Amino acid sequence: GEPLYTEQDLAVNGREGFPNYRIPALTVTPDGDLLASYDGRPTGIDAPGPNSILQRRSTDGGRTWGEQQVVSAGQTTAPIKGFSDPSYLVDRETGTIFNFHVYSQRQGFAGSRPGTDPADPNVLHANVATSTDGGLTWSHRTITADITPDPGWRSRFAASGEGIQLRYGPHAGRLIQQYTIINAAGAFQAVSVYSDDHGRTWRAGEAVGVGMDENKTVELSDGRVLLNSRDSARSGYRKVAVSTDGGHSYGPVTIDRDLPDPTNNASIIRAFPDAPAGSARAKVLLFSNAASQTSRSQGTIRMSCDDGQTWPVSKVFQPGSMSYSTLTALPDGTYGLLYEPGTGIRYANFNLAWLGGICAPFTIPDVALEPGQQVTVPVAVTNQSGIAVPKPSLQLDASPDWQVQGSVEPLMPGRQAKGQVTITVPAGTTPGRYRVGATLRTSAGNASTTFTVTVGLLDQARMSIADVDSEETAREDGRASNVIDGNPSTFWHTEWSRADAPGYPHRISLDLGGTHTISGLQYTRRQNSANEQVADYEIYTSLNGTTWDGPVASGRFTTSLAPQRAVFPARDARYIRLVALSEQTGHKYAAVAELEVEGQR
Ligand SMILES: OC[C@H]1O[C@@H](O)[C@H](O)[C@@H](O)[C@H]1O
Numbered sequence: 001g002e003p004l005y006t007e008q009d010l011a012v013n014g015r016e017g018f019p020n021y022r023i024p025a026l027t028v029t030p031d032g033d034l035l036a037s038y039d040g041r042p043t044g045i046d047a048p049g050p051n052s053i054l055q056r057r058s059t060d061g062g063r064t065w066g067e068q069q070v071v072s073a074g075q076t077t078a079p080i081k082g083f084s085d086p087s088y089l090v091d092r093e094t095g096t097i098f099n100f101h102v103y104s105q106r107q108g109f110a111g112s113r114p115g116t117d118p119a120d121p122n123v124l125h126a127n128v129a130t131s132t133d134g135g136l137t138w139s140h141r142t143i144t145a146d147i148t149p150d151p152g153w154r155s156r157f158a159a160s161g162e163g164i165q166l167r168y169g170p171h172a173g174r175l176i177q178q179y180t181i182i183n184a185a186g187a188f189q190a191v192s193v194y195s196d197d198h199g200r201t202w203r204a205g206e207a208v209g210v211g212m213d214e215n216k217t218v219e220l221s222d223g224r225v226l227l228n229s230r231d232s233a234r235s236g237y238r239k240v241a242v243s244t245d246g247g248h249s250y251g252p253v254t255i256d257r258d259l260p261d262p263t264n265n266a267s268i269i270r271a272f273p274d275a276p277a278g279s280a281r282a283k284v285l286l287f288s289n290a291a292s293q294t295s296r297s298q299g300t301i302r303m304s305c306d307d308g309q310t311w312p313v314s315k316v317f318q319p320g321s322m323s324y325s326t327l328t329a330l331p332d333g334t335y336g337l338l339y340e341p342g343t344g345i346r347y348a349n350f351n352l353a354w355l356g357g358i359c360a361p362f363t364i365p366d367v368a369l370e371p372g373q374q375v376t377v378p379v380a381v382t383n384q385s386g387i388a389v390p391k392p393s394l395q396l397d398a399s400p401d402w403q404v405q406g407s408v409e410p411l412m413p414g415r416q417a418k419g420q421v422t423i424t425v426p427a428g429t430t431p432g433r434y435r436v437g438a439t440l441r442t443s444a445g446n447a448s449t450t451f452t453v454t455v456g457l458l459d460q461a462r463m464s465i466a467d468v469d470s471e472e473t474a475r476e477d478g479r480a481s482n483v484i485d486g487n488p489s490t491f492w493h494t495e496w497s498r499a500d501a502p503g504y505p506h507r508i509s510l511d512l513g514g515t516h517t518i519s520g521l522q523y524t525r526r527q528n529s530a531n532e533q534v535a536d537y538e539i540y541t542s543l544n545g546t547t548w549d550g551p552v553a554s555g556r557f558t559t560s561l562a563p564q565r566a567v568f569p570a571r572d573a574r575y576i577r578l579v580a581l582s583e584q585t586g587h588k589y590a591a592v593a594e595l596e597v598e599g600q601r
């Protein structure tokens with residue numbers, strides 16, 4: 001009906017007893033009470049810090065909130081004890097509420113030492129506060145032994161937010177709470193901690209991935225359990241994995257490109273928790289995170305209607321600073337959101353009318369053209385339920401002096417619609433990769449996508465490596481071939497340490513895959529490291545591949561994270577070579593994220 005979005009702060013840094021309030025966790029008790037838990041940081045730091053687990057309660061749907069009570073109190077005086085990162089799990093069958101959190105003594109997550117002994121002050125323990133009276137009183141347990149099946153698991157912490165109780169299949173009733181472990185090999189993995197006896201005993205299942213962190217799980221419409229992870233390896237995205245069992249294991253982990261993330265926590269819940277298996281309502285997910293890849297800001301709620309395959313809906317709830325966010329389905333049909341705005345922890349409530357709308361994900365392919373060209377590309381839209389939409393619009397978002405227009409036929413229930421986009425780009429358009437936003441406007445809600453229009457660059461898929469002076473391939477993936485894959489997150493790296501290899505006259509040559517008239521080369525520095533940045537370069541070209549002619553260009557490029565051009569009077573060439581002569585701060589390695597060649601296909 002009428003759109004709703006209201007907010008209020010539950011904790012304000014400096015007020016009510018603590019200098020710092022962080023890490024939100026939201027839930028709704030069986031009686032309909034809302035419970036909000038967060039850390040109270042007297043020192044403004046996580047574990048080993050003397051943090052406390054607090055709690056505020058709302059008995060009127062989230063409008064008014066009670067006083068801040070303590071769930072797990074940390075000791076500031078020696079010996080120092082702390083409680084951090086809460087995560088709620090409500091057993092809807094029995095009514096018990098679990099608040100999972102970290103119990104620290106001397107070490108935190110990165111410094112915890114092997115062991116399961118509650119007494120050992122050097123391991124980071126996994127605790128659980130249990131309540132059978134709605135959250136009023138709690139009973140504490142240290143469950144580290146129960147969940148550390150492999151002695152190599154030297155550290156752990158429960159991903160804050162809220163866990164889940166399975167409703168479908170043979171493992172229906174099972175409580176699952178996600179964790180992050182540090183194995184023997186030093187790797188950060190994800191593991192599900194579950195209980196089949198309503199929480200009396202907790203076992204850990206099989207660990208997943210490498211470079212994982214705070215992860216989240218949801219039950220799909222068919223009973224499958226999807227996992228959505230923060231990526232410690234910082235690719236600017238969420239890692240996802242899925243499971244089909246009850247001794248818990250997930251298949252391969254992959255990066256989801258529809259979900260940008262600045263390596264931060266995020267929520268993913270079932271929009272209709274009590275829907276039947278297989279139904280449309282059972283397929284609707286809500287995900288909240290910070291959409292920025294360089295900052296913890298641009299907090300946005302996204303919506304899926306096909307179990308997480310597509311994410312057509314999105315809307316920003318906090319354009320400004322936004323870090324951790326947690327979601328919860330309220331019994332009135334709305335959704336509760338607890339997040340970090342930089343001032344502490346704030347509570348928000350919104351309904352689906354406020355999101356925009358329409359479950360009509362659409363695809364528009366990636367286009368390559370020469371400046372001064374026009375191209376028309378097809379649009380394919382997949383439609384949802386009570387949606388017979390006779391007049392939908394297509395609003396494209398591009399560079400102002402580019403003419404972009406689009407149209408789509410009507411949307412009929414359960415059918416696919418067709419359409420097209422015409423892009424005309426001017427002759428003086430600088431070669432590059434262009435992101436074009438697409439918005440399917442309809443009187444029943446929003447639906448958006450993005451495609452890429454590449455102007456004036458050759459096709460990398462036709463490119464290969466002719467030669468390279470050195471590639472790091474033992475300790476990491478520093479392959480010369482990572483420059484031609486269209487991903488700034490992967491890089492070529494010169495054979496680095498743990499093998500005292502060559503120094504600076506470094507070089508990489510590309511086989512363009514046929515003769516082309518080229519006038520330039522663009523290069524992108526390695527993004528998350530500053531010590532292998534190329535300074536002085538020289539470009540050489542060739543048609544036979546053995547006799548090289550140049551330097552066709554020379555220069556010193558900057559420390560810019562975006563692509564940098566190296567232009568030269570057009571010429572025919574089958575091969576292009578970049579000779580790196582020095583590094584920005586005199587270091588010995590070279591790493592290039594991407595190499596783009598400007599020319600005519
Ligand atoms: O020795 C190579 C490595 O050195 C590290 O100090 C650096 O942070 C890494 O990005 C990698 O370059």
Ligand code: NA
Binds near residue numbers: 482486487490593594
């Ligand atoms: Na790359």
